[model samples]
Target: STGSATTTPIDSLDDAYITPVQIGTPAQTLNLDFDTGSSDLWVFSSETTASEVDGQTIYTPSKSTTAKLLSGATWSISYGDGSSSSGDVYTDTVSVGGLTVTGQAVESAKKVSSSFTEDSTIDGLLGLAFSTLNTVSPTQQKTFFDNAKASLDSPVFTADLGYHAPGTYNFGFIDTTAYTGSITYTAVSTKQGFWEWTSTGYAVGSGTFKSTSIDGIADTGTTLLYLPATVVSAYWAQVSGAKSSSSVGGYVFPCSATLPSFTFGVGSARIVIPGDYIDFGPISTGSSSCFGGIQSSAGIGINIFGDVALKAAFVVFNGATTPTLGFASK
Candidate 1:
């Protein structure tokens, strides 16, 4: 069986994309952040502290006849910013894009930090990464993709994120018509519990493609492209007034600056990121300075090909034992 779903950006600048997922017996739908960087399917629920709930929808597992409490099971996942959310587990009927997965573990948040509450548009997160990254204790849970893989037409899924419009996420088979040209496949390393891969090289704008290896992951959860300091600096240098700022935070430049396009090698294929995507809107609305969509990966020590890079092409996540990633220009 195969499934298809569409995700829309929460805002015009593509801050984050959310997809509708149906959970429980009667099917309570909620817009979830489909994060490929994590492995816990958590939701804002009736179990959550009422004060912590904002404008987001909550999942009521109690109302579902098919819901089963995963007694004593718990999950906790922390963010890079130092805060975290922890919860207990429940197994319920879950479906995404019409792909049904029975007994899917759904973590109901008992405690959530202020950051999670601030995102009113996101009801919770649905992780698409490896099951090895799952936070459920006692026994880790498999992601929706992992659980549905056996029933899928193909052992893979595709992510096609749009600039400002809705993009499709297809499970099972790749729609050849969705992309142009042949796909460039690359070996993926699941050792780190991520869709990690090495790129052939990268070039700042139309500059020469440096024949160097750039190790990175295709993280749909992350909002920006993060690369090495050297690579990041090289790209920002091309912008007229771009600089690493301390006060406003992050790399910023004149909002009107004519930013240059960035290109990176996916195997032998080159994927180009348009300059407008790099123009990550203004620092605050109406501000003259803007944040660069691409940044330095110095903090984590690994390059991140986030939405800034993923949006440029049709990405495939091969779910075989020895997995690989395929990229095609759209």
Candidate 2:
């Protein structure tokens, strides 16, 4: 039924990036990342000071007639990546593909740190994770997904990131053309506000990562792929040329010629990250090599497979169900 919603993945440095549901009509689409880690819809606004609007895309409200601002309310959100933003409230008629929803919640932050000012495009992030993280109080707690669900023809919304081109994220329907088996479903754990998973193992090259078994979570809010220290170190050990550097808050390596196909297993399912994802790029400061994915944290309550991991799989979060994550292949 989702014949028109398939998408292709494109390169963004070392990891693959997808084009999320744009904020405007087909004639004027604003490419955004479909993040499932947090619940907020924000874009850079031209009204933001140049210092605050340095690296991301800002939406021109002058071009859209449906945009409205909420008076006397302020909102701000912080991410696990040490990045944060705060802005006033606004509501607008936002479009994604062929669907349009009125009064969509949007935040406009005028103050930002340099972590948001370097690399990439866009003004702000569209938090697609869940409603629990919304900074708006209970009186103002409705999120974009809650609003969009009314207009969407189906209960399901899916993302399609193709093998070698710009990827697409769709709401309301599942693209059935990409899979062969019945999808695996898991319930969302509201206690943590993240789609947590149980990992069985991890493997890189010919060896198994020593500490792959653990409680894990898949977060769309985070941009980098993070793992426990043991799993991360084992992954980097495979490639003779791969090494850690300091570009993307993680490791980097020169891995074009010899990149390994890494595997992550969750119960009976396994996800693979191709070689192209391994050669992220050179580090910013030193001549030392950098890796596409790296070990960032250990012993943290959660091990997250971020947007870098989600774009490669077909995922569904069922808020209607008790615990809300369902996994499928795309």
Candidate 3:
């Protein structure tokens, strides 16, 4: 049978979505950020130094009868934001919704960066990227999705991320009711362990769609959309008061400035992000400036279609041979 999970935004930030997952035999539940950009299922554990854990909950592997240590196995990962975590490994029964997978590798974090510690709401991260990207050393680990795929009726999962609202992540089944119009499919390059695809072109507002090949990954963990610097500049150029703000670390515009909608080409389909969503709240409290949700991917080399972009559509991550991405309006 298929598994499903309800995902809720962390605070009003819209930065990431967290879902409850049960790990180990006694079913210790943890609220984890489901990340599509990385592939290592890790949680804060009893092994973590108390000072480093802050207010986050820790998973006690010893409390679970099914916990099995994977001797010599460990994992470490650092994110694009420079946040990191590392830990030993254990095999346990993991479950999401009603679906369960036996012998799933659950990395228990012994060390975590301040970024994770300060954010006490998230206990861990559940990586949905390909198993090839799993960070466990000596032997790579398989993600929950990878281990449960064989038992699924259809090797697919759909991400329905909403704006300032709760959404659902459905495994092995597509809920047509969650999206509108026809779902458009595109080929994905999994060699990089990402749902990477090429956008044929894009346009700012109702302007002409330029034929520029944009290579990017669909990353749910990231908060904003990142594109080449030139493209980012072009989009902001259309806004009368928009300017690059070194202090804010991205483009910012007068809170009163009208933003034009951004659209990206997905083969024949055009995924459009609403104009209002571009203004990512305010730069800071009581500030008349606002940060742009679409920023420059200057040194990163690859663009990222993060939550700001994904929330505009219903996305299907199909694991069939030659993985495909299906996108439809929410």
Candidate 2 residue runs with Cα over 4 Å from true position: 1-11, 14-29, 55-57, 60-64, 137-139, 162-164, 180-182, 206-212, 241-249, 252-257, 285-288, 299-301
Question: Where is model 3 more than 4 Å wrong at Cα?
Answer: none
Candidate 2 has an lDDT of 0.61
> What's model 1's TM-score?
0.98
Go through the candidates in order and give each one's C-alpha lDDT. 0.92, 0.61, 0.91
Q: What value does the lDDT take at residue 31 in candidate 3?
A: 93
The 10-residue segment of model 1 with minimum total lDDT is 77-86
What is candidate 1's lDDT per residue for 1-330, written digit by digit as tens? 999999999988898899999999899999998988889999999999999999999999989999999999999999654657899999999998989999999999999999889989999999998999999999999999999999999999999999988999999999999999999999999998999999998898879989889999999988899999899999999999899997876799998898899999988899999999888888997999999999989887678889999999999999987899999999
lDDT of 2 by residue, 1-330 (tens): 121333433344524343544453222355455567777776666666677665566776656666666767677777776777776766777666656666777776666666666635544566666577788643355566667775565655655444445555667766676554656765456666666766667778656543356566776555456787767777777767655555455666663456776677655676666755545555554545554654656645578877556655776655454545556655
Superposed by TM-score, candidate 1 places the C-alpha of residue 142 at a distance from the truth, in angstroms, of 0.8
Which stretch of 10 consecutive residues in model 2 shows the poorest summed lDDT?
A: 1-10
Q: Candidate 1 lDDT (Cα, whole model)?
A: 0.92
Ranked candidates (TM-score, high to low): 1, 3, 2
In terms of lDDT, the best-performing candidate is 1
